[PDB]
Design a protein around this ligand. Structure first.
Ligand SMILES: [Zn+2]
Length: 254
DNA sequence: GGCTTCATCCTG
DNA sequence: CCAGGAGAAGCC
């Protein structure tokens, strides 16, 4: 799961328990158990996302930081229910009527206020593609910046320092949308291409965020190797780029 | 810039 | 069943 999925989940967590007094708090990790007593009777004030980083803010200025990597997943349950599963529970934030459970995640930390700025991941993530304040021409500026203008898109679109929230599926769907392979640099695009890329970097993630869980978002190439491209009819192929699987259409990506 | 590595879950 | 496959940091 990447940005869009994490924000959908964060929205579900806030709907479940934002503002509601915690009646129980449980952490699997021994070093976090000390926060159990401290948080009972506090409440989540909001669940912030910074790309794939999920920050659950509490009313006593603590912030639970969690990153699902490839395997973590949140689930909202009615309080006291525990749908059977083989995943290991890692976090329970429980209120009178709704409880949220975080399973499998291994990167979980309790942050004090300073660390919202200094934590290693939070310190180096770039702007969030789902941030409404983030505009195409800002993305365009960033693409052309000295920092990123010479990066191949293959790696750049996975680098959370560039744009937070982008992941593999988004990488392939964005590059296909604008007809580019992974081996290009922002410096060598024409202005039309650059403008198309800057818009797709935002609109595709925002589209997935709005509709993936429900015109609606669909993969055009991701996991479609062997199928005919819906734009040009060519057969979508699967290779490896940036040591991650990569899908693309040889017929209309150049 | 290329691994090498960690981490959990699912499949094949 | 066991191995490989599926986000980010580390060590050159
Ligand atoms: Zn095509």
């Amino acid at each position: 799961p990447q940005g869009p999925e994490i924000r959908r989940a964060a929205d579900n967590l806030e709907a479940a328990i934002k503002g509601k007094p915690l009646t129980d708090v449980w952490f699997a990790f021994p070093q976090l158990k000390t926060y159990q007593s401290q948080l009972i009777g506090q409440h989540v004030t909001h669940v912030e996302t910074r790309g794939k980083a999920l920050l659950t803010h509490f009313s006593n200025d603590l912030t639970l930081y969690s990153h699902n990597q490839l395997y973590g997943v949140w689930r909202v349950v009615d309080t006291g229910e525990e749908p059977q599963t083989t995943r290991v529970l890692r976090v329970k934030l429980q209120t009178a009527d709704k409880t949220i459970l975080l399973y499998s995640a291994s990167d979980i930390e309790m942050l004090r206020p300073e660390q919202l700025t200094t934590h290693p991941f939070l310190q180096r993530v770039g702007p969030d593609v789902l941030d409404p304040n983030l505009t195409p021409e800002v993305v365009k500026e960033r693409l052309l910046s000295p920092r990123f203008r010479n990066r191949q898109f293959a790696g750049l679109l996975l680098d959370q320092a560039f744009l937070a929230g982008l992941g593999n599926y988004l990488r392939v769907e964005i590059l296909w949308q604008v007809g580019l392979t992974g081996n290009h640099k922002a410096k060598d695009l024409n202005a039309a291409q650059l403008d198309a890329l800057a818009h797709a970097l935002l609109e595709i993630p925002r589209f997935s965020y709005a509709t993936r869980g429900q015109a609606l978002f669909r993969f055009k190439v991701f996991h479609r190797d062997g199928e005919p491209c819906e734009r040009c009819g060519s057969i979508i192929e699967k290779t490896t780029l940036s040591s991650r699987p990569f899908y693309w259409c040889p017929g209309c990506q150049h």
